[PDB]
Every structure is written in C-alpha cells, then in structure tokens.
Amino acid sequence: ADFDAVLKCWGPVEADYTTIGGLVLTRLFKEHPETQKLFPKFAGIAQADIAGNAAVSAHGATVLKKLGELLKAKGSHAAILKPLANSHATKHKIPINNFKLISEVLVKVMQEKAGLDAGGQTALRNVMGIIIADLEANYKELGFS
Ligand code: HEM
Fold first, then answer.
1. How many Å lie between the centroid of ligand 1 and the Cα of residue 63?
2. In the structure, which protein residues have their CB atom closer than 6 angstroms to any atom of ligand 1?
3. Measuring CA to CA, which of 70, 73, 114, 136 is 20 to 30 A from 10?
4. Ordered domains of the chain (ranges, CATH)
C-alpha cells in the first residue's frame, strides 16, 4: 500500500525528471555539502552554480527514473537493488547514511512540488526505509557493514 500511496503523487515527478532531479540534487548538496564531494564530476562546483547546471539535473533525472522503476516494479524490489548496491558500494564508494539524506530531501521536494500529504510523506519514508535496508544488507554481503 505504501508504494501505491507514493505512486499516487509520482505524476509531477515523472512529468519532469530533469527539473525535479535537479531540485533534489541541488538541495542535497546545499543541505549536506559533504555529499557533493562523493560525486567527483560535481565536487567543487560553487553552490550558486548548481541549480542551473544541466549535467547535475541530468544525473538527478537518472536517479529519479531508477526510483520510479523500483516503485512500479511488479516483481522483486530487492532484485533491482542488487546492482545499485553493487555499484554504489564498490564503484562510487557511498556510505549508507547518504541514502537517508537523499531520501529526506526527496520527501520535502515531493511535499513541495508533488502534492504528497502527511500520510504520503510517511509512506515514502517507509518505502525509502525498505530500499535503504536492502542496500545496507547487500553492502554487508560485499564486506561493507
Ligand atoms: C536511492 C537513491 C539513489 C538512487 C536511485 C541512485 C541511482 C543511481 C543510478 C541509476 C546511477 C547510474 C548507474 C550506477 O552507477 O549504478 C547512479 C550513479 C551514481 N550515484 Fe547514485 N543513486 C542514489 C543515491 C546516491 C547517493 C546518496 C550518492 C552520493 C551521495 C550517489 C552517488 C552516485 C555517484 C557518484 C554515481 C556516479 C555518477 C557518474 O559517474 O555519472 N548515489 N546512482
């Protein structure tokens, strides 16, 4: 049910993955500047120059499309998340806590831009908690507990 609650507000997100993706990453980097350093392509870009940066927005679109794919999955969520865990632990070297930070940002962006109400905010926190716990379990399988 919590997946359906989020999907009932996903229209404005999927309508413009570039704009909303850029909003999410711009806010992440503003509120959590240490996360920007985990993207070598973006690390060191002055904060004032991030909102207008097309490459940042394009990467945010990649993130949100992957999250959409997960939400819409009629099969295993864990299966889609295994490659994501593998790349984020072993290629990008992203500590798990950073997924909680981007999930905090997404809840706020959907509250502000996608009509996600109080119950929807809780549903999205629950869904992101499922995703993050699966990423964390897969990190542990790789030796990154
Ligand atoms: C649930 C949240 C996230 C989703 C859905 C997501 C999704 C993706 C996808 C689909 C890619 C491209 C394919 C791949 O390399 O696996 C990617 C790349 C990447 N992600 Fe994430 N990601 C998330 C969170 C994060 C966080 C929190 C960070 C760092 C704070 C991060 C850092 C990176 C980096 C550095 C790349 C490589 C970018 C490039 O070289 O172009 N990701 N992510």
1. 6
2. 35, 38-39, 41, 59, 62-63, 66-67, 84, 87-88, 92, 94, 98-99, 102, 131
3. 136
4. 1-145 (1.10.490.10)
